[PDB]
């Protein structure tokens, strides 16, 4: 049984800036273990029967984990343009798995404010499909080259999300869990 | 009926002292965050801070913040701003406006704006 | 500081004819977190369309936003009289709210 348990019940998910991916393989994957596991807010899947989920076969499976809030959750899809699809996470053209997402308030919101979860405010180009960018270098907005320095007209890109269990529902922060299958000449592996 | 009401506008010269009261009628003041806008004369508004009063937490935009304290009294329902060292610049149109609890979040309600002067 | 600029400072318009307010903004924003509020002169604004397509209670058919990623646009097709006021983008997604530098809209 793919470590479906790890990804899914994990003690503290990754900020979207960087988020963690995990490529599963050489392990027997069942996809009723989603639909018990969370009340799964958002669960859409590209290209893929969710019914076929079960009874097809894939070399690798990717495990994108990451923290955005719930407005944001529809931007993790092909042909979305916005904050987290242009700069912290992007979907190729013609991806192909299921994105899912649940609210998470009562775990990853704390009453003064959760500042652990960042996002990419500001990126000079916008990401290639399935990139990670973790680069925290201040951004070169203003015309003065900024030399390292964080303040006007050169901003740190990474500004927190700040959740709070009060938030609005839209601002309440949503683990999203996408998955991505390769299906390269390679041995199958994942299967049911 | 859901409305936001406000205190009159005072006159107070340059000093530390200044509360500007939200009166808030027709639904339940602890449940929706209030977030106070100041809008200078003659420039599009700008975002002051943000005071949940269930609980009593606050958010503040960067240049007014640890300058201007946001709290607010359950009992009466009142969501008051204080400022300090009052400027010219301070004088504006000061807003309160609470942030919509739905899936979009936005100022779904506003107070009639109290005008603050500074001289 | 995610910094928001309106196309039009002032806008000049006729009844019946479409007039376009753009909201370019310096960092891409996700578009349920761009909204339009219309303030009329010296009264409080009101929400006009939130998330950059879905209006707001009372707000006539004719209003619909458009645009998503960095360009952010508001579309009236037909002007009326009451149509005329000053429309303030605002941003959600970036944490220090900043409102547009609004577009003054006024019959031709």
């Known amino acids: 049984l793919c470590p479906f348990d790890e990804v899914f019940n994990a003690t503290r998910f990754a900020s979207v800036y960087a988020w963690n991916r995990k490529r599963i393989s050489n392990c027997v994957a069942d996809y009723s273990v989603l639909y018990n596991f969370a009340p799964f807010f958002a669960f859409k899947c590209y290209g893929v029967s969710p019914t076929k989920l079960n009874d097809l076969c894939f070399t690798n499976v990717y495990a994108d984990s990451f923290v955005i809030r719930g407005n944001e959750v529809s931007q993790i899809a092909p042909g979305q343009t916005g904050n987290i699809a242009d700069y912290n996470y992007k979907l190729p053209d013609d991806f192909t798995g299921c994105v899912i997402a649940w609210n998470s308030n009562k775990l990853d919101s704390k009453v003064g404010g959760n500042y652990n979860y960042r996002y990419r405010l500001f990126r000079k180009s916008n990401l290639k499909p399935f990139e990670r960018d973790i680069s925290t270098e201040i951004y070169q907005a203003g015309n003065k080259p900024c030399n390292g320095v964080a303040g006007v007209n050169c901003y740190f890109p990474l500004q927190s999300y700040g959740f709070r269990p009060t938030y609005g529902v839209g601002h309440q922060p949503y683990r999203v869990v996408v998955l991505s299958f390769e299906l390269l000449h390679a041995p199958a592996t994942v299967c049911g | 009926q859901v409305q936001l009401q406000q205190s009159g506008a005072e006159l107070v010269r340059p000093g530390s002292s200044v509360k500007i009261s939200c009166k808030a009628s027709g639904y339940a003041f602890s449940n929706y965050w209030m977030n106070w806008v100041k809008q200078r004369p003659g420039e599009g508004l700008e975002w002051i801070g943000q005071?949940?009063?269930?609980?009593?937490?606050?958010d503040y935009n960067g240049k007014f913040k640890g300058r201007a304290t946001l709290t607010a009294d359950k009992s009466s329902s009142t969501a008051y701003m204080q400022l300090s060292s009052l400027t010219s610049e301070d004088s504006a149109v000061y807003f309160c406006?609470?942030?919509?609890?739905?899936?979009?979040?936005?100022?779904?309600?506003w107070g009639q704006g109290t005008t603050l002067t500074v001289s | 500081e995610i910094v928001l600029t309106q196309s039009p400072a002032l806008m000049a318009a006729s009844p019946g004819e479409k007039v376009t307010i753009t909201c370019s903004v310096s960092?891409?924003?996700?578009?349920?977190?761009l909204h339009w509020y219309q303030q009329k002169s010296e009264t409080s604004p009101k929400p006009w369309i939130y998330?950059?397509?879905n209006l707001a209670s009372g707000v006539p058919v004719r209003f619909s936003g458009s645009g998503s990623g960095t360009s952010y646009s508001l579309t009236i097709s037909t002007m009326e009289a009451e149509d005329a006021a000053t429309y303030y983008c605002?941003?959600?997604?970036?944490?220090?709210?900043?409102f547009g530098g609004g577009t003054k809209l006024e019959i031709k």
């Open positions: 605002q941003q959600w997604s970036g944490y220090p709210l900043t």
């Open positions: 005071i949940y009063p269930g609980d009593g937490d606050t």
């Open positions: 960092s891409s924003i996700g578009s349920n977190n």
């Open positions: 998330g950059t397509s």
């Open positions: 406006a609470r942030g919509d609890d739905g899936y979009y979040v936005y100022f779904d309600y």
